[PDB]
Structure formats: structure tokens, C-alpha cells
């Protein structure tokens, strides 16, 4: 477990990385609106979908960060949504997929971002936060320690990245200030600061520039292990009249993947993208994983 060649095994690429390395330092691929794969097929006539394949496909391709959007039902469960629409995927469904993947590849960790996507259904016993933490988070698969989480402690576990308020249970990355459609910097834990580029609805040119600017900042601070960088390459300029996410991703994915490959960086951050598949070249998630050669 000490060969850069091991990074080529997309199901176990975190294996060769030293356990003392903070997850924040690792360049990690992620999927934006991860659970939208069941309604993505154009025949479904549903807009806003961002993935063609399921969670296991995403994980087997190298993704370790998942952007989960949930809604509390009146049955005390959390289901996945995209705005007001139910995605026909549940939170338990995602967790089970992550569990199996971790069982098959115990060298890896799964980072789960959880955000309240839609108002709770009327008649729900508790709140979104209380229901999640009490019925889901309590599961031992979820790492309950915090700080600048190290890969060593995360292996075989799901590390929560809170994007919901009202948390009362310790574990993962605390919820932090997340302004809308901006590139911002704030604090996360006592020993972790973060910079996020999440301009999800700006024009194409400003988006590519923003992705590159944030990657530049990431590289210029490559060995600052206490600074977290999250870079969303996903874009949806417009409302719904135009299901533009795929169009933009078809250009952005290859462009950014190529930019990374050409710069041969030592760190690119946590790159969250739309449409993980094998259609474009180079493959963004693969180039992101390869940027970890410096850590081997």
C-alpha cells in the first residue's frame, strides 16, 4: 500500500495514502446532487437531474463525497429530493450502498454531505436534524469524532459533512456558513477553515474562471493541511425551462479534467461534479484522484 499505481484502482484509491493525512488535504472526487440518477433518463421528463448512474457506480468510479439532499416525511424517515420533487431514493438507501462499498473496500471512507432540501412534511414528529441524528446518525458506521479528521480514523466509516442546522450530536464536520451562489471562506471546526466555490448559476466563463481560481488558491496553499477546499464544477445557469446541467457538464468536465492533467498539481481540493460517467476524456474524477501522487 505504497505505490502511486494503487491510485489507479478506483475502488480502493485511498489505500496508498498515509493514515495521518487529514481528509481535507486529499484531493477527492464528489458528485453533485448524487441521488438524482433514477429520474435522469429524459423519458422521465424530469428536469434538474445531475447523474446518470447509481451510488455504487459513482463509488466504483472513485467518488467518495456525496451531496445528499433530504426531506423529512411524516413517517419519521428522510427521503432524497431535488427541490419539491421526490427522487425515489431514500437516505437509508444511500447509507446501505455506502455500507456495502465500505465492507468491500475497507481502505476507503465515504463523506456524506447532508442538507435539508425541502420543508418537512406536515405531521412530522420531530425536526429534520433530530430525526436524522436519532434514527440514522446514531449508527456506528458514522464517525463521531471531529477536528481535522484524518484518513486513518475515517477508513471504513461514513464521515458526515453537515449542511443542516440544529445539530445536537458530535461527529464529522460541523455545519457552517454557506452563502448562496458564491465562493466564500469561513470556519468549520476549531482546527479547520474552509473555502468553497459554489457559484451554481453564474455564466459559463465566470464558472470556469471560478473553478480555476479556486484550484489555484488550493495549489498555492497545497501543504496547509488545516484548510479545506471544496470546488463544485457543476453549473445550472437558468431556472427549469432549460435543463442545462448536462450541457454545461459536457464542456466543463473535459475542460477542467484537462486543466488538471496539464498542470499536474499536487492538490486540487474536493472536486464535486455533475455526471460521473466514462464519456469524456480526460475523466475529471480520475485526474482529481491522480493529484494525490504527492501523498504516496
Interface with a second copy: number of residues (CB under 8 A): 21
Binding residues among 145-204 for a second copy as defined by CB under 8 A: 203-204
Contacts to a second copy from residues 69-128, by CB under 8 A: none
Residue 10 binds a second copy, judged by CB under 8 A: no
278 near a second copy, judged by CB under 8 A:
no
According to CB under 8 A, which residues from 195 to 234 bind a second copy?
Answer: 203-204
Task: Tell which one of 2, 20, 43, 122 touches a second copy (CB under 8 A).
Answer: 43
Measured between its terminal Cα atoms, the distance across the chain in Å is 9
Residue 148 in grid coordinates: 481535522
CA distance 135 to 76: 8
Of 61, 81, 82, 227, the active-site residue reads 82
Give which of 231, 237, 234 is closest to 260, Cα–Cα. Answer: 231
Is 32 among the residues known to form the active site? yes
- Cβ distance to a second copy smaller for residue 31 or 148: 31
Which member of 240, 262, 264, 278 binds a second copy (CB under 8 A)?
240
The residues, any chain, with a CB within 8 Å of residue 119's CB and separated by 6 or more, are 71
Which residues have CB under 8 Å from 196's CB, separation 6+? 178, 183, 184, 185, 229, 230, 231, 232
C-alpha cell at position 188:
468549520
Q: Residues 9, 130, 250, 266: which binds a second copy (CB under 8 A)?
A: 250
CB of 241 to a second copy, least distance (A): 5
**Burial class (CB within 10 angstroms; exposed 0-12, middle 13-18, buried 19+) of 3:** exposed
Q: Binding of a second copy at residue 246 (CB under 8 A)?
A: yes
- 241 makes contact with a second copy (CB under 8 A): yes
| 248, 260, 268, 271: residue in contact with a second copy (rule CB under 8 A) | 248
Applying CB under 8 A, which of residues 3, 4, 8, 42 lies at the interface with a second copy? 42
Is the sign of the CA dihedral 147, 211, 236, 270 positive or negative? Answer: negative
**Between 12 and 38, CB nearer to a second copy:** 38
- Burial-class residue 168 by CB neighbours within 10 Å (0-12, 13-18, 19+): exposed
Q: Is the peptide bond before 91 cis (omega within 30 degrees of 0)?
A: no
Binding of a second copy by 258 (CB under 8 A)? no
**CB of 242 vs a second copy, minimal distance in Å:** 5
- Whichever of 203 and 264 has its CB closer to a second copy, that residue is 203
Closest approach of Cβ 254 to a second copy, in Å? 9
Looking at beta carbons only, is 40 or 148 nearer to a second copy? 40
Q: Report the alpha-carbon distance of residue 64 to residue 68 in Å, rounded.
A: 12
| 81 is annotated as an active-site residue | no
Closest CA to 60 of 19, 29, 26, 96: 29
Contacts to a second copy by CB under 8 A:
42-47, 203-204, 237-244, 246-248, 250, 279
Write out the catalytic residue numbers: 32, 82
Amino acid at each position: 500500500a505504497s505505490s502511486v499505481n494503487e491510485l489507479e484502482n478506483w475502488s480502493k484509491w485511498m489505500q496508498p495514502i498515509p493514515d495521518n493525512i487529514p481528509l481535507a488535504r486529499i484531493s477527492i472526487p464528489g458528485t453533485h446532487d448524487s441521488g438524482t440518477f433514477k429520474l435522469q433518463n429524459p423519458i422521465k421528463q424530469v428536469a434538474g437531474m445531475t447523474q446518470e448512474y447509481d451510488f455504487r457506480y459513482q463509488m466504483d468510479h472513485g467518488a467518495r463525497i456525496f451531496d445528499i439532499r433530504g426531506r423529512l416525511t411524516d413517517d419519521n424517515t428522510i427521503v432524497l429530493h431535488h427541490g419539491p420533487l421526490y427522487l425515489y431514493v431514500t437516505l437509508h438507501e444511500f447509507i446501505n450502498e455506502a455500507k456495502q462499498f465500505l465492507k468491500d473496500n475497507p481502505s476507503e471512507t465515504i463523506i456524506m454531505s447532508l442538507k435539508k432540501e425541502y420543508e418537512d412534511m406536515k405531521g412530522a414528529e420531530g425536526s429534520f436534524s433530530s430525526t436524522f441524528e436519532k434514527n440514522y446518525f446514531v449508527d456506528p458506521i458514522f464517525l463521531k469524532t471531529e477536528g481535522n479528521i484524518k484518513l486513518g480514523d475515517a477508513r471504513g466509516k461514513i464521515v458526515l459533512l453537515k449542511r443542516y442546522s440544529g445539530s445536537n450530536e458530535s461527529g464529522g464536520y460541523n455545519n457552517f456558513y454557506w452563502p448562496d451562489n458564491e465562493t466564500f471562506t469561513t470556519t468549520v471546526n476549531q482546527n479547520v477553515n474552509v473555502t468553497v466555490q459554489d457559484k451554481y448559476k453564474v455564466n459559463y466563463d465566470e464558472k470556469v474562471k471560478s473553478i480555476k481560481d479556486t484550484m489555484d488558491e488550493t495549489m498555492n496553499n497545497s501543504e496547509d493541511l488545516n484548510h479545506l477546499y471544496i470546488n463544485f464544477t457543476s453549473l445550472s445557469s437558468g431556472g427549469t425551462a432549460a435543463n442545462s446541467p448536462y450541457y454545461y457538464a459536457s464542456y466543463i468536465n473535459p475542460e477542467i479534467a484537462n486543466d488538471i492533467k496539464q498542470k499536474n498539481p499536487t492538490r486540487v481540493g474536493w472536486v464535486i461534479q455533475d455526471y460521473i460517467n466514462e464519456k469524456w476524456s480526460p475523466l475529471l474524477y480520475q485526474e482529481v484522484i491522480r493529484a494525490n501522487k504527492s501523498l504516496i
